[PDB]
Design a protein around this ligand. Sequence first.
Ligand SMILES: CS(=O)(=O)c1cccc(Oc2cccc(-c3ccnc4c(C(F)(F)F)cccc34)c2)c1
Ligand SMILES: CS(=O)(=O)c1cccc(Oc2cccc(-c3ccnc4c(C(F)(F)F)cccc34)c2)c1
Lengths: 232, 233
Amino acid sequence: QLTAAQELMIQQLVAAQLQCNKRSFSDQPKVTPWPDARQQRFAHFTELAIISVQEIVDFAKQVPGFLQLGREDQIALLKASTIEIMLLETARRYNHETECITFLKDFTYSKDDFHRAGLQVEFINPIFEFSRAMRRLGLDDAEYALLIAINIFSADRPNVQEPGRVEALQQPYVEALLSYTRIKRPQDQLRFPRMLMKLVSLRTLSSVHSEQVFALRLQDKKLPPLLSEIWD
Amino acid sequence: LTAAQELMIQQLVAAQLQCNKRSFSDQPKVTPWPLGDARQQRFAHFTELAIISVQEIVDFAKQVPGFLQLGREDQIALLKASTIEIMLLETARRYNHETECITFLKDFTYSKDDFHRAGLQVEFINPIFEFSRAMRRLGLDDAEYALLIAINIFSADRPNVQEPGRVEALQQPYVEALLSYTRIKRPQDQLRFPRMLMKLVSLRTLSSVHSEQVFALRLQDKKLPPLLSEIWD
Ligand SMILES: CS(=O)(=O)c1cccc(Oc2cccc(-c3ccnc4c(C(F)(F)F)cccc34)c2)c1
Ligand SMILES: CS(=O)(=O)c1cccc(Oc2cccc(-c3ccnc4c(C(F)(F)F)cccc34)c2)c1
């Protein structure tokens, strides 16, 4: 069984995830209309990304352990994990039958909509393949939330000053997920390793994203201030 | 372990040892290391160590059960991606914590400065030695190393794989076997096994860092030999 402390930890992540979701409804009426129209579609997409950044930041603050780290390590961990979490949340919003992604409650986007918004096929196709691979895993809410917490506290991120501390904070989340997947699905021993394998996939996708932001340079496209401070 | 799992592990361990025995034999074949125009000779020496490692990885993979049942194009594609990663996994294995040096082939030892003298960037060398010392903390033996490499080989998300579903299904028994082996080795250290898989996560970053190292060289117009050029640019 999960202990009282572990359940408290899990319920906190699940509940914080859901409250950050209710802060999608607040932003939706204030977003650039989807159509010079090409730049408006890029802006539209960058604003979605910024809504997601705000959500991620506000989630991290709620994750027990995060505010125990120094400010620089808080920044260093969020800078790396932001794209990985975005893609994870993107995968969760994917509809297998329509093959669209649904952002901010409604607003559905196809592969071609991603393209119309200025993104390249070298980046788009891995996103949709990762989206498809994630649906197949069929992660529940506690699984999703715990994977994100584990993702956040990765010690090998660039510019981490206290990787020993970061590694120690990840431990209880690794342990809770191990205990959870043992109780939830006793007859699937490989669920937990399979979940961790997706972090490997996410590192590759992050590298693919860096290439994509580099390609914006020559396309006469610029990241807005808040995205630029993380990705430029 | 089951009879099937233990035979598997023995197969991998014996392939790994036949690979290492060939590493030993190759020492007198290698261009000497020139001491303190002679940059180029150090770079070719290192280049030769990697060529040796490439064909050793090719030979190991053919011994990994199931790998020859994949189409040849996927075999090629799997190896093209994971070679850099298997090299570093092997580098880490030969890292000496006392001396802060790595032992290639039989007794050729190289420090951080030696890596820089052979023509590699600090951006790349630093992480190699950090991963090596990270690897030493988990205290992996021969079976665990051999299993992690086989797991590394069968990653379904590599570029240009035609049957990723088949690749993911061949990775399964290897993951299985490591989980059982690590639960039998340290029954009280649950978190050793997840930490080993996070190493594959670290290896993906390391791979991108290597693509930059190769890119930096293209910018200085200093070339890789055919075999490494084929795989890396
Ligand atoms: C809107 S939401 O429902 O809150 C949500 C949910 C999940 C993810 C999400 O963020 C998005 C949505 C669409 C695109 C991007 C995005 C990711 C990475 N790069 C981008 C870039 C660039 F850097 F140039 F490559 C430009 C424009 C958008 C992006 C992020 C929003
Ligand atoms: C010698 S051995 O015992 O067979 C052995 C053991 C373990 C690993 C191994 O492979 C090596 C050894 C030394 C260097 C490299 C290497 C890796 C990546 N890039 C390289 C590059 C470049 F591309 F320019 F960046 C140039 C030269 C060498 C390398 C690989 C060999």
